[PDB]
Design a protein around this ligand. Structure first.
Ligand SMILES: *[C@@H]1O[C@H](CO[C@@H]2O[C@@H](C)[C@@H](O)[C@@H](O)[C@@H]2O)[C@@H](O[C@@H]2O[C@H](CO)[C@@H](O[C@@H]3O[C@H](CO[C@H]4O[C@H](CO)[C@@H](O)[C@H](O[C@H]5O[C@H](CO)[C@@H](O)[C@H](O)[C@@H]5O)[C@@H]4O)[C@@H](O)[C@H](O[C@H]4O[C@H](CO)[C@@H](O)[C@H](O)[C@@H]4O)[C@@H]3O)[C@H](O)[C@H]2NC(C)=O)[C@H](O)[C@H]1NC(C)=O
Ligand SMILES: C[C@H](N[C@@H](CCc1ccccc1)C(=O)O)C(=O)N1[C@H](C(=O)O)C[C@H]2CCCC[C@@H]21
Ligand SMILES: *[C@@H]1O[C@H](CO)[C@@H](O)[C@H](O)[C@H]1NC(C)=O
Ligand SMILES: [Cl-]
Ligand SMILES: [Cl-]
Ligand SMILES: [Zn+2]
Length: 575
């Protein structure tokens, strides 16, 4: 009966608002006031949402989705039959919940200490070391010590997590948890499509990699850099070598052309986290998109508090499932990286607002990549010389131009293979290809194959380097960021063209383009109501993911790199 399916999705939606609101409320109260009291309330709300998932999921499974006419009710009910972890029996779910809590807490309290002196946390202490030290050994101490204290301590938990997370997946009809995750894209050709895309970025990444490799050989010496080999994983300015912009100063194409201290200028000019978020809000409203509601300004946590309260710092954006209350929680630092991350979180928020009228089961991005790309699009524009000049964090030529593209490459191209490899790895863990006997070996095999990195210190039994990246102990899928990095350029190219921009794509700045706002709004309003190629068509006028836009943005940089690498006889890649 068509009418019994309408009634059920109606009830599911009313009761999910209540129960999902209560839980997000409590997970926030925890996340911005870690107590044991806020841990008790969080744990009680877990149960309550499991018990709601089970009730509604068991009812949804009694429907034959084959016999159901209405496509919206059909899609809603098929998602509700997926209970996730709530599929697990009582004991196993208790244990699943506790392992995730344990994993994340171990990552969060891990420090690295010097004998007789100070213990450094990841944020900001070790991050600063990796960003500003130019001494092999000091980079190594932080790189190895972070792996030693965070990675190794996670390993004890990881086999039981894989077993429970695959058990939930199988009870929802998937083969393993990697299957489940990939199913969010609704794209059977996903693994092929993804690989094609990564293969089109290889000329840019190999050329950038070779050139940076030569620059590290200049600074750190011939005995430490093989000009025909992988780069050591601790010399790229970042704990995971996922972005390389902190070594902009070793790799400047045109040192002759001086570029400003964005960070010194922000401090110098009395930039606060609040001003940083107000700039993002303004950019969105320049586009004709939506302003954050007053409530967001009052309830958000835009900076680390100083009232004693302890908090989880990792930047995240929060939907409270009532169409009114949205929040960012970020221990914002006053600089450029964090201004871009503020944009990224603000794009999460914009999406929440745009799709607040859909039923909650459709309150998600058209795919996870879409969710991650929105803010980055606005930020490509923010980061232009023309725009930074107008915030008065830059002054202002071809030299300046290649310099800008290099800065961008180090944040965008560099991240391409890293974002690809995380879930390459996890997918093989979940499918049983990789066992705990070779978690670590297979990590490094992929670090080599995709990124062209090696570990400065030979790894040993008990090492578990993936546990040293947040997203692994916290069980947050990562392929979304690879997708985002591709599609964000596609979105920029389209909005730029909507906005009437002529000439090279990288000089485009879309500030105040109502046309660009429109293209994005109508896609974001769709939520998860339709298969994603529809949202792509809306934005870009075609329905494929495509590296064309990215290659085109960096084309001047590719030309330069190729002439430069050729001039030095670089041998691209690494046997
Ligand atoms: C298959 O069924 C689809 C789903 O039907 C809906 O779901 C089931 C479970 C039952 O509840 C149904 O009775 C219900 O219709 C169906 O698709 C729907 O089609 C209608 C058009 O026929 C679309 O309606 C539009 O919705 C806009 C905004 O939606 C929300 O905001 C309203 C603002 O006042 C509000 O009243 C309401 O609020 C709450 O609802 C959701 C629950 O779904 C809840 O989660 C959330 O919290 C909301 O607050 C509403 O949902 C309207 O603004 C829009 O008006 C436009 O038209 C006006 C009149 O011409 C114009 O003046 C104006 O300019 C607008 O352009 C209109 O009412 C509905 O969005 C759509 N549902 C979805 C989610 O896709 C579909 O038709 C069926 N398929 C077939 C082939 O029959
Ligand atoms: C800061 C950002 N934080 C994530 C949110 C992570 C999270 C998910 C679920 C529960 C708790 C935390 C996000 O906003 O997607 C992040 O981790 N990253 C990822 C990372 O920093 O490794 C990759 C980044 C691409 C550019 C924007 C920031 C992306
Ligand atoms: C933090 O700790 C406890 C836990 O609920 C509570 O009594 C206190 O008011 C909380 N403070 C906040 C939210 O600032
Ligand atoms: Cl690593
Ligand atoms: Cl994903
Ligand atoms: Zn994000």
């Amino acid at each position: 009966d068509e009418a019994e399916a309408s009634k059920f999705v109606e009830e599911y939606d009313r009761t999910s608002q209540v129960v999902w609101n209560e839980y997000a409320g409590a997970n926030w109260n925890y996340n911005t006031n870690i107590t044991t009291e806020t841990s008790k309330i969080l744990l009680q709300k877990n149960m309550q949402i499991a018990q709601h998932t089970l009730k509604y999921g068991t009812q949804a499974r009694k429907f034959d989705v084959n016999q159901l006419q209405n496509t919206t009710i059909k899609r809603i009910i098929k998602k509700v039959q997926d209970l996730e972890r709530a599929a697990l029996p009582a004991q196993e779910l208790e244990e699943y919940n506790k392992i995730l809590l344990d994993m994340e807490t171990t990552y969060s309290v891990a420090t690295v200490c010097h004998p007789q002196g100070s213990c450094l946390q990841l944020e900001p202490d070790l991050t600063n070391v990796m960003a500003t030290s130019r001494k092999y050994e000091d980079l190594l101490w932080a790189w190895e010590g972070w792996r030693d204290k965070a990675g190794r301590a996670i390993l004890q938990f990881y086999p039981k997590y894989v077993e429970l997370i695959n058990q939930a997946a199988r009870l929802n009809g998937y083969v393993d948890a990697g299957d489940s995750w990939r199913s969010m894209y609704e794209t059977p050709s996903l693994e092929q499509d993804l690989e094609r895309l990564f293969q089109e970025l290889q000329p840019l990444y190999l050329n950038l990699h070779a050139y940076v490799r030569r620059a590290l050989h200049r600074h750190y010496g011939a005995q430490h850099i093989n000009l025909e080999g992988p780069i050591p994983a601790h010399l790229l300015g970042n704990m995971w070598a996922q972005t390389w912009s902190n070594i902009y100063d070793l790799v400047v194409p045109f040192p002759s052309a001086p570029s400003m201290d964005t960070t010194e200028a922000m401090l110098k000019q009395g930039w606060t986290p609040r001003r940083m978020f107000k700039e993002a809000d303004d950019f969105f409203t320049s586009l004709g998109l939506l302003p954050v509601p007053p409530e967001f300004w009052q309830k958000s946590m835009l900076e680390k508090p100083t009232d004693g309260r302890e908090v989880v710092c990792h930047a995240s954006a929060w939907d409270f499932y009532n169409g009114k209350d949205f929040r960012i929680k970020q221990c914002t630092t006053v600089n450029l990286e964090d201004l871009v991350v503020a944009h990224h979180e603000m794009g999460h928020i914009q999406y929440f607002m745009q799709y607040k009228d859909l039923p909650v089961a459709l309150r998600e991005g058209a795919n996870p990549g879409f969710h991650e790309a929105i803010g980055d699009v606005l930020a490509l524009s923010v980061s232009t010389p023309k725009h930074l000049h107008s915030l008065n964090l830059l002054s202002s030529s071809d030299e300046h131009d290649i310099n800008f593209l290099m800065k961008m490459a180090l944040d965008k191209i560099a991240f391409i293979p890293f974002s690809y490899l995380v879930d390459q790895w996890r997918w093989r863990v979940f499918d049983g290809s990789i066992t705990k006997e070779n978690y670590n070996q297979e990590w490094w095999s992929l670090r080599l194959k995709y990124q062209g990195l090696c570990p400065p210190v030979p790894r040993t039994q008990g090492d578990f380097d993936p546990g040293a990246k947040f997203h692994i102990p916290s069980s947050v899928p990562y392929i979304r960021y690879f997708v985002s990095f591709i599609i964000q350029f596609q979105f920029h190219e389209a909005l730029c063209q909507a906005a009437g921009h002529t000439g090279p794509l990288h000089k485009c700045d879309i500030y105040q383009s109502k046309e660009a706002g429109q293209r994005l709004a109508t896609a974001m309003k769709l939520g998860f109501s339709r298969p994603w190629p529809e949202a792509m068509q809306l934005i870009t006028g075609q329905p494929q993911m495509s590296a064309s836009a990215m290659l085109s943005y960096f084309k001047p940089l590719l030309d330069w790199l190729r002439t430069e690498n050729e001039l030095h006889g670089e041998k691209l890649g690494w046997p």
